[PDB]
Amino acid sequence: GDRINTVRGPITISEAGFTLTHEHICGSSAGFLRAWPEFFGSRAALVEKAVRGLRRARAAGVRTIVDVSTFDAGRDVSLLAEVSRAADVHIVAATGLWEDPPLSMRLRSVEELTQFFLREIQYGIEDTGIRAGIIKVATQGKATPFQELVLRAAARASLATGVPVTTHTFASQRDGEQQAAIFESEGLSPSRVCIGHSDDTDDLSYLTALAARGYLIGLDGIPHSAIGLEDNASASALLGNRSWQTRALLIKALIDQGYMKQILVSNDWLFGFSSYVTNIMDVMDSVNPDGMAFIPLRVIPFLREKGVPQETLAGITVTNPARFLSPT
Amino acid sequence: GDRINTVRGPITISEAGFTLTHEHICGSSAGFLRAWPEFFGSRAALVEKAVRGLRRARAAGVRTIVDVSTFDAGRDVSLLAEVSRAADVHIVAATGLWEDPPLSMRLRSVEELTQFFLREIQYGIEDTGIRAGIIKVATQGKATPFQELVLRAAARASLATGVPVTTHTFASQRDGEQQAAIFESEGLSPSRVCIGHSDDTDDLSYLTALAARGYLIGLDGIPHSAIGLEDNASASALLGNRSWQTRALLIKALIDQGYMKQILVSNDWLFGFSSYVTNIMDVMDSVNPDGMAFIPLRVIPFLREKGVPQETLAGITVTNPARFLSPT
Ligand SMILES: [Zn+2]
Ligand SMILES: [Zn+2]
Ligand SMILES: [Zn+2]
Ligand SMILES: [Zn+2]
């Protein structure tokens, strides 16, 4: 209630500080890093790259990241703890399910899924004792029958524990509207939910319809852009053709509409990425060499020059994540 | 070449003895047993159930099982080693990919997949040092583009190492024909391939077309039957409405056609099964309380009473698996 669970234990709300609410140490699949570490060069190479990136983010002012990798995104909390220890950056781990649940998850009931999410929040992840501080869910268009169960189980786990929910959307398909409907049918407060990848769309009617009913809006992929890589079909499909400035200006748009307290900003960066095409991490790193430091080093000064007060940006990067993550 | 790799190290061909060539300790998904052991009651309960079942199989004459669980079927070779040690039954582990590859596998090239399979055969699975003795692959109808890559990578790994390939089919769709075509396009000898779940069909033209060109025929689900459970839709979809006697008589049919040296027989049993509906293991155990001992306790005497000589059944259960598994 007055503590947020991290991969190194509980921290006070004050300790979280500048917080990136949607990040990944490694976007993978369950068991994959253990079974095929050479895909990333080596496990040690992945750790070192992550520690260097988090250290640079910490020098730019970041104090906490929320790693929203789930079980099926290959979340390895022992890896997160090692990297968090070495970089002196808090890492909040996630439960929930992302875009790639295996059969052993896809065949489960809403009650079974709730047990699993509660296990990772209340007891621990695997045998590590590390407890999730957030629940991650996903749709990519209209929800599959199973995804409806996942969203309902996430609501039930959140209602039992006060831990918030954050989502993956196909933003241009307005997924947040169906996600909101399911969450609200289970009695979940919108104040406990971040509708993520919302910077993937320019539709202000969709974004303000979510914000008006109390949802937090995840503008979490600001440096994702393939402008300058139209040659590259896979990178264009993943990153889009909208500039980082266009994405960042949605932060100002929601501020100007009165929603500054409901905005959560992040990079959605990673240090390894096996769940997409080979060498995508190299392509992404050439687009954005600042990595997770892109928000404080480039987005914050950009919004300042566009006239957003520093106090407003401090509220967005410090106050909003603390209010969101604090169990309630 | 003169050794078969098991989860406890290499064994001589003579040590394999009576061998069940298609079995599972636990049909699951990667990482699932680690993340949610309570699904199986407990990890300790799963181990104990498996040790009891293997001990009963050993008392019935079984000396070796081939666990054809892949990475994506949740193969845990440390679990296999513990159960193999406690029951004094050799267990051969598998590499390859089954019906549920995650994104981090599905996006890989044929070259990358070959590296992964070779890793598990030549170096070891995860950090355990345990090496696979067989490569498992799967189609369920016409092969997906990715499944074509898996089959080709399996052929390449087999050609480099001499380790055999065994397959999952939708037998009534005659999957073995396309599997054979892809394998042969890569230069793989049919003598290194078992076309599995072949007892799911009664089509003798399909079965003899595979056997005639040299494939081994996996009659591996003999006790799978939902006769007596027409009420149960999920069990009927999984197990089928053909009797175990009907499946077992395919063994005699292929013997009578001259293929006794190409028949491999098994139960396709499991001690846990999270990749299907909840409580399926209870349903399956009520259908077949003998578990993995069903082949020696019921199928062998049944074929004897139908006139198959004991020497022929000994060739099928001892000689054929040794010839198949011996790297060449
Ligand atoms: Zn996402
Ligand atoms: Zn993400
Ligand atoms: Zn199968
Ligand atoms: Zn099987």
Numbering used by the authors:
A (entry chain A), B (entry chain A): 34 to 361
Wording from the paper:
The enzyme phospho­triesterase (PTE) is capable of hydrolyzing such OP compounds. Accordingly, it has been characterized from a number of bacterial sources, including Brevundimonas diminuta (Bd; formerly Pseudomonas diminuta), Flavobacterium spp. and Agrobacterium radiobacter. Carbon dioxide reacts with the side chain of Lys169 to form a carbamate functional group within the active site, which serves as a bridging ligand to the α-Zn2+ and β-Zn2+ ions, both of which are required for full catalytic activity.
However, in the case of the three crystal structures of methylphosphonic acid (A53-5, C23-3 and C23M-2) the same methyl group is oriented in a different direction, into a space defined by His57, Ile106, Trp131, Asp301 and Leu303.
